[PDB]
C-alpha cells in the first residue's frame, strides 16, 4: 500500500469554515440579549448545546463526501498502534474501524464535553489538536473524559444473569421424539394482530411446518400442502395476501410428556435444515438471548 503519514497529511476540510459561519451568527446574538436583561443566563445555558451538538456531526459528513469524488486514496492519521490504519476514509468505508465520532477528533473539531454533575460546558472547544488546545480549553476536556469508563463498568461485570435463570429450569426441555401423536386441529394459530398494537413480522412464521390446509384465494392448485417445510421465500407468499389465521405446529402446542419434537419446532438456525433429534433447544435458547 505504501501508506504513510506527514505534517501536511492532516489536512482540514474547507467545509469547516462554512458551518462555523452560521454558528457565529447565533453566538454574536446570545450575549447581546444577555447584557440587556431580557435573557437569563439559564436560558442561554441550554441553547448553546442545540447548535454545536449538531455542528460537529455535519462536518464529518461533509468531509467523507469529498473523499469519494476526485480522490479516495488520501492518507491521513498519525503514528500509533491499535487496530485502525492509514487513509482515514479507506478504512472507514471498508467497514474495518473508524466511527464518525473518532475521526472528528482528527480532521474536525473537538466537540462538546460534560460537567461532573450533568450539565454541559458553556463555551465550546473548537480548537483542534492541529493548532493545539488552550490551557483553559484543555481543563474542560478532562471532565467529559470521565464519562467513558463509567458507563461500561456494568456490562463488563456479568451480563450472563439472564441465562442464569433459564438454564436452571429448561434443563429438561429437550427433543424427546420425532412425531408425538397430535392431529392438526388443536394447536396454535398465530394471528396477524399481535405486538404492541399491530406490528406483525416474518420472525414468528420463520421456519415452521404448517398444519391444516389453509385455503388461500387465487387460481386452482395454489393451496399449501399440509406436510411441507417453511422457507424464507415460502413465508413471503403467506404474509402477502392471507392476512388471516395460519394453522402451524408450535412448541407450546406439543402433546407429549416433557419435551418437544422436531416438527413442532422448525429450522435449526445454526445450519440450514430441520432440527435433529438431540438439539437442546432449552439450553441454546438461553444463551442465544443471554449473549446479546
Amino acid at each position: 500500500s505504501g501508506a504513510s503519514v506527514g505534517i501536511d497529511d492532516m489536512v482540514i476540510p474547507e467545509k469547516k469554515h462554512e458551518i462555523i459561519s452560521e454558528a457565529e451568527a447565533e453566538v454574536a446574538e446570545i450575549q447581546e440579549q444577555f447584557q440587556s436583561g431580557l435573557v437569563t443566563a439559564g436560558e442561554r445555558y441550554n441553547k448553546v448545546i442545540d447548535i454545536w451538538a449538531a455542528a460537529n456531526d455535519r462536518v464529518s459528513k461533509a468531509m467523507m463526501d469529498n473523499l469519494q469524488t476526485e480522490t479516495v486514496i488520501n492518507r491521513d492519521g498519525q503514528e500509533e498502534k491499535q487496530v485502525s490504519f492509514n487513509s482515514i476514509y479507506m478504512m472507514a468505508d471498508s467497514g474495518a474501524r473508524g466511527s464518525a465520532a473518532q475521526i472528528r477528533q482528527l480532521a474536525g473539531m473537538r466537540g462538546l464535553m460534560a460537567k461532573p454533575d450533568g450539565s454541559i460546558i458553556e463555551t465550546p472547544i473548537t480548537a483542534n489538536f492541529r493548532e493545539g488546545l488552550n490551557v483553559l480549553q484543555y481543563f474542560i476536556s478532562t471532565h467529559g473524559a470521565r464519562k467513558g469508563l463509567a458507563d461500561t463498568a456494568l456490562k463488563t461485570a456479568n451480563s450472563g444473569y439472564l441465562t442464569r435463570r433459564l438454564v436452571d429450569v429448561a434443563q429438561d426441555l429437550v427433543v424427546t421424539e420425532d412425531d408425538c401423536g397430535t392431529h392438526e386441529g388443536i394447536m396454535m394459530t398465530p394471528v396477524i394482530e399481535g405486538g404492541d398494537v399491530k406490528e406483525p413480522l416474518r420472525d414468528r412464521v420463520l421456519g415452521r411446518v404448517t398444519a391444516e390446509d389453509v385455503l388461500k384465494p387465487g387460481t386452482a392448485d395454489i393451496l399449501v400442502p399440509r406436510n411441507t417445510l417453511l422457507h424464507e421465500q415460502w413465508c413471503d407468499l403467506l404474509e402477502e395476501n392471507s392476512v388471516d389465521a395460519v394453522k402451524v405446529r408450535s412448541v407450546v402446542s406439543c402433546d407429549t410428556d416433557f419435551g418437544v419434537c422436531a416438527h413442532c419446532y422448525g429450522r435449526d438456525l445454526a445450519r440450514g435444515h430441520i432440527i435433529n433429534k438431540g438439539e437442546a433447544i432449552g439450553v441454546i435458547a438461553a444463551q442465544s438471548i443471554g449473549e446479546p
Binding site: 450575549q31 498502534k81 477528533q105 481543563f139 478532562t142 473524559a145 469508563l149 463509567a150
Partner: protein
C-alpha cells in the same frame, strides 16, 4: 551550539520543594531540642495524669527525655529491626502511707526509665520497619464542622435551612432539634430517645409565655408545642395550669406506669428508676469534655462555628444554663425567614488532608493510653514500697500500637523503586481511602469526577485509570500544603483595574468566596485592563462581565499540570486520555544500560533528579582523592595535613544491590580525580538518568510502514541488529538462602571437605564451606554444601540389594544441598556468613 528558544512567559516564582510536605510536619511532633513543650508534650497531657483511684495513689507527669538509641546503627539492617530511640519520662507515685516524691527521707523517686521507643526520620523523610522502609501517604476527608444538607419526604415541616439539622462534632452528640407536628414533638438526644420537647425548655427556665406565646404568632405550625400545654379556647387562667405553665411539680398525668413532671422525669425514661440523688448522671457529658471542642482550644472547630452560628461560650457549654441549645435554635428560624447559608458537599474548601505529622499524633496517643489497662493489673498485686520503679508501666503494650501503624495500615505502602522519578510521585498522591465514616463506597457520580475548583490544586489528568477513577489523584507542581490541611495555591492580587506582580498564597476556603480571572487574559501595563468581558469563574460556575468584581488572577499556566505530566513534549497536542496512559506507564519504567536524554524536552527533567535525591551532592569544597567505580573519597581542609588526622568522609557508592521490586539502582562516577569540587557538584549520576535529567528510555529509527499481516493487532517486529548491541538489558536479581537446623538426628555443618561419593560438589565449594564469586552453569546444581546424616547412620538390609546392582557404595552421609528452583538461574552477588558472631544476634 546555539540554543534557540521560543516561548518564555517569565514566572515570578519557581516550583517549591516537592518534598516539603513530608519533612516539616514530622518535625512538629517529636520536639527534642528546638521547641520545649508543644507537640509531643500534648500527647502526655491526654494520658496523664493517669488516675487509678483505689485509695491514695496518684501518678503525675513531669517531662520527657531522648538519650541514646538501643545499640549501633549499622546492625539493624541485617536482622530486621526498626531503628529507633527509647524515651525517658519522670514518674511521681504516692503510697497510702503518705509517700510522695518531695523529700529525701521516706520519699523515693525515679527519673530515668526507658520503655517506649518510637522510630525517627532521616534525610529524605522515610521510615524503616523490619528492614523494608515504609512511607505514609496523607488521605483526603471532609473536615468536621457544621454543614447544611437536605432531607427527602416531609414536604410539610420545619428545621434549619431545609429540614433535619445535621452536625458532626467528632463523637460528642448529634443534637437534633427537628419539628414534627400533630402531637409529640420530634427530638432526639444521642440515638433516638424519643420524648416530649415541651418539658425540655421548661428545664432551661422557660415558662409557657416564651416559646409558644411569643413565636406562634409568626407561625401556626406549632401543633407539637400546643399539645402538652393544652391551650384550647380562652378560659379561666388560674386553676387551669398544666405541664407548660408550672415548673416544679408539673401536671401529673400520663397513660402509663410512671408519670411525667418536667424536671424530675428526664431520667424516668430509663426503667426502672432511682432517686434524684444524681443531678449530673448525663448532663456532665455536654460541658467540660472533648464533646463540644473538636480540637485543642477550638483550633479547628472555630472557623466552622462563629462564622455560621453566633458567637461562642467556653470550650463546652456549662451548668444549668446552656448557650449551645439557644444559639442553634436561633438559626433554624433565622434562615427560615431569609438568610443564605448553603454548604457544598463536593467542595475542596470543606475538605482537608492529614499529613504524617498529624497522623503521628493520634496514633501515638492510642498506643500510650494502652498501658493504662496494664498499670492497674500490677497494682492489685503490689506490696508496699516496691511498686515504685518500672514495676507498673510496660514497654510491650506501648510499643505495639506504634509498630502496627508504620507497616500495617491503609496509609502505609511500599515505595515504588521501579523508577527514581516514580519514587517522588508515589508520595505526591492523596488517596481518597481512609475512615469509614468520612469515606464510603456509595455512588458518587458528582464526586468521583473532577471539579472546576481543582484547577491549580489537583491535576485533573494524572489519575489511576480503572474502577478506582477519581478517588486516587496527584498534587500539582505549584501545589503545597500548609500546617493546617487545605491545599494552598499562589494567586496574584488586583484592585480595580490595576494589577500587582506580587503573588498571594490562598487556601481553597476563600477560593469560592472570591472571583479568580484567567492567566491568558490581556494586560497592558500594571494599571489598566484590556477587556470588558473578563472570562473568570466563581466556585464551579464560570461567570462573565464586570472587571471590578475580580481580585485574584492566575500567575502561572503550569499550575494545572502535575509534576510528572509536565515532562512530556507538547501537551496541547495530546488528549487527556493518552496523557494519562503515558504517565501511569512511565512510573513502571526500569533503569537500562543504554540510557540517554530525549532529543526534545521541557526543562523540568533536571529539577526531578535533584529533589528526589538520586545523585550524590557534596556538602563541602575540596579536591578528590580516589575515583573508584565503587567508592569515592573526598578529603576536606579543616584539619592539619596528616595521613591519619583529617575530615575523612567516605561516600559509600551503592553497587549492584537488591530493591523493593527487584530493580537496578546503581551509580556511575562522573567526576575525575584532581579537579576540585564544591557544594552542588554531582559526584555520580543515578541509575536511569544521564547528567541528571530524565533519560528513562532511548531513541531508535523507524521505517513507518505495515508488514504483510505480521503486524495484525498491536503486533510489532523488531530488527535483530538491536539485539546484537544488547541495548535492552535489565538485571532482575533474586534471593536464595540456606538455613541449618538442629534436627534430632544430629546438627549438620557446612564445610568444603565433605565425605561425598561425588566430585561435582567439590568443584564449586573450595573456599572452606563457601564458594568463589562469579561463574556459570545451569539450574539444578549445588550452591552451599550440606551434610545431613539420615537414617541414624544405619543402612537397611533390603536397601543394600538395590545399590548392589548399580555399584555398592552407600555412604553414611549424603549431599542434601539446596538445589536451584525451576526457571532461570543467575550469577551471585555477595556472600554473608555469620558463624555465631559475638554481637547481639537473636
Amino acid at each position: 551550539r546555539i540554543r534557540k528558544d521560543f516561548g518564555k512567559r517569565p514566572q515570578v516564582l519557581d516550583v517549591p520543594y516537592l518534598l516539603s510536605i513530608q519533612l516539616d510536619s514530622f518535625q512538629k511532633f517529636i520536639e527534642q531540642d528546638p521547641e520545649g513543650q508543644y507537640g509531643l508534650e500534648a500527647a502526655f497531657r491526654s494520658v496523664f495524669p493517669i488516675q487509678s483511684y483505689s485509695g491514695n495513689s496518684e501518678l503525675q507527669y513531669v517531662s520527657y527525655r531522648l538519650g541514646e538509641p538501643v545499640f549501633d546503627v549499622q546492625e539493624c539492617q541485617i536482622r530486621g529491626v526498626t531503628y529507633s530511640a527509647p524515651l525517658r519520662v519522670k514518674l511521681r507515685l504516692v503510697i497510702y502511707e503518705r509517700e510522695a516524691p518531695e523529700g529525701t527521707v521516706k520519699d523515693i523517686k525515679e527519673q530515668e526509665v526507658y520503655m517506649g521507643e518510637i522510630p525517627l526520620m532521616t534525610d529524605n523523610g522515610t521510615f524503616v520497619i523490619n528492614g523494608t522502609e515504609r512511607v505514609i501517604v496523607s488521605q483526603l476527608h471532609r473536615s468536621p464542622g457544621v454543614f447544611f444538607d437536605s432531607d427527602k419526604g416531609k414536604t410539610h415541616s420545619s428545621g434549619k435551612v431545609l429540614y433535619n439539622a445535621r452536625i458532626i462534632p467528632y463523637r460528642g452528640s448529634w443534637l437534633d432539634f427537628e419539628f414534627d407536628p400533630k402531637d409529640n414533638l420530634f427530638v432526639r438526644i444521642d440515638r433516638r430517645r424519643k420524648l416530649p420537647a415541651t418539658i425540655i425548655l421548661r428545664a432551661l427556665n422557660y415558662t409557657t409565655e416564651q416559646i409558644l406565646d411569643l413565636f406562634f404568632e409568626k407561625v401556626d405550625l406549632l401543633a407539637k408545642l400546643s399539645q402538652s400545654g393544652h391551650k384550647r379556647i380562652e378560659t379561666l387562667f388560674t386553676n387551669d395550669l398544666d405541664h407548660g405553665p408550672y415548673i416544679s411539680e408539673t401536671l401529673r398525668v400520663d397513660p402509663t406506669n410512671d408519670r411525667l413532671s418536667a424536671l424530675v422525669e428526664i431520667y424516668r425514661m430509663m426503667r426502672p428508676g432511682e432517686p434524684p440523688t444524681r443531678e449530673a448522671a448525663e448532663s456532665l457529658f455536654e460541658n467540660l469534655f472533648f464533646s463540644e471542642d473538636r480540637y485543642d482550644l477550638s483550633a479547628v472547630g472555630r472557623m466552622k462555628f462563629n462564622r455560621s452560628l453566633l458567637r461562642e461560650e467556653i470550650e463546652g457549654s456549662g451548668i444549668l444554663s446552656k448557650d449551645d441549645i439557644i444559639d442553634v435554635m436561633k438559626k433554624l428560624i433565622d434562615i427560615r425567614n431569609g438568610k443564605g447559608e448553603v454548604d457544598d458537599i463536593d467542595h475542596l474548601g470543606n475538605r482537608r488532608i492529614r499529613s504524617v505529622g498529624e497522623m503521628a499524633e493520634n496514633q501515638f496517643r492510642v498506643g500510650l493510653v494502652r498501658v493504662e489497662r496494664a498499670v492497674k493489673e500490677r497494682l492489685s498485686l503490689g506490696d508496699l514500697d516496691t511498686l515504685m520503679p518500672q514495676d507498673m508501666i510496660n514497654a510491650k503494650p506501648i510499643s505495639a500500637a506504634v509498630k502496627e501503624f508504620f507497616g500495617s495500615s491503609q496509609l502505609s505502602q511500599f515505595m515504588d523503586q521501579n523508577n527514581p522519578l516514580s519514587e517522588i510521585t508515589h508520595k505526591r498522591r492523596i488517596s481518597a481511602l481512609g475512615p469509614g465514616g468520612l469515606t464510603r463506597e456509595r455512588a458518587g457520580f458528582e464526586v468521583r469526577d473532577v471539579h472546576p475548583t481543582h484547577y491549580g490544586r489537583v491535576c485533573p489528568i494524572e489519575t489511576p485509570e480503572g474502577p478506582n477513577i477519581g478517588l486516587i489523584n496527584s498534587l500539582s507542581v505549584y501545589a503545597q500544603t500548609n500546617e493546617y490541611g487545605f491545599l494552598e495555591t499562589p494567586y496574584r492580587k488586583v484592585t480595580d483595574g490595576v494589577v500587582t506582580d506580587e503573588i498571594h498564597y490562598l487556601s481553597a476556603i476563600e477560593e469560592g468566596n472570591y472571583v479568580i480571572a484567567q492567566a491568558n487574559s490581556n494586560l497592558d501595563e500594571e494599571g489598566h485592563f484590556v477587556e470588558d468581558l473578563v472570562t473568570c469563574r466563581s466556585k464551579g460556575e464560570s461567570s462573565l462581565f464586570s472587571r471590578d468584581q475580580v481580585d485574584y488572577m492566575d500567575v502561572s499556566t503550569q499550575q494545572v499540570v502535575s509534576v510528572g505530566a509536565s515532562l512530556i513534549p507538547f501537551l496541547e497536542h495530546d488528549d487527556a486520555n493518552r496523557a494519562l496512559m503515558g504517565a501511569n506507564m512511565q512510573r513502571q519504567a526500569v533503569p537500562t544500560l543504554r540510557a540517554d536524554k530525549p532529543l526534545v524536552g521541557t526543562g523540568m527533567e533536571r529539577a526531578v533528579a535533584v529533589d528526589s535525591g538520586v545523585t550524590a551532592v557534596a556538602k563541602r569544597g575540596g579536591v578528590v582523592q580516589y575515583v573508584d567505580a565503587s567508592r569515592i573519597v573526598i578529603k576536606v581542609n579543616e584539619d592539619e595535613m596528616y595521613p591519619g588526622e583529617a575530615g575523612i568522609d567516605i561516600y559509600n557508592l551503592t553497587k549492584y544491590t537488591r530493591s523493593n521490586q527487584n530493580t537496578c539502582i546503581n551509580q556511575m562516577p562522573c567526576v575525575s580525580l584532581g579537579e576540585p569540587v564544591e557544594r552542588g557538584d554531582v559526584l555520580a549520576d543515578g541509575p536511569s538518568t544521564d547528567l541528571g535529567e530524565l533519560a528513562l528510555g532511548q531513541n531508535m529509527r523507524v521505517a513507518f510502514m505495515p508488514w504483510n499481516g505480521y503486524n495484525f493487532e498491536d503486533s510489532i517486529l523488531v530488527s535483530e541488529r538491536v539485539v546484537q548491541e544488547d541495548r535492552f538489558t535489565t538485571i532482575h536479581i533474586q534471593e536464595l538462602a540456606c538455613v541449618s537446623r538442629d534436627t534430632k538426628l544430629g546438627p549438620e555443618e557446612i564445610t568444603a571437605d565433605i565425605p561425598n561419593v561425588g566430585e561435582a560438589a567439590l568443584s564449586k565449594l573450595d573456599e572452606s564451606g563457601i564458594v568463589y564469586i562469579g561463574a556459570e552453569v545451569t539450574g539444578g546444581d549445588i550452591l552451599v554444601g550440606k551434610v545431613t546424616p539420615k537414617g541414624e547412620t544405619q543402612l537397611t538390609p533390603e536397601e543394600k540389594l538395590l545399590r548392589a546392582i548399580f555399584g555398592e557404595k552407600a555412604s553414611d552421609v549424603k549431599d542434601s544441598s539446596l538445589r536451584v528452583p525451576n526457571g532461570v538461574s543467575g550469577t551471585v552477588i555477595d556472600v554473608q556468613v555469620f558463624t555465631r558472631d559475638g554481637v547481639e544476634k537473636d
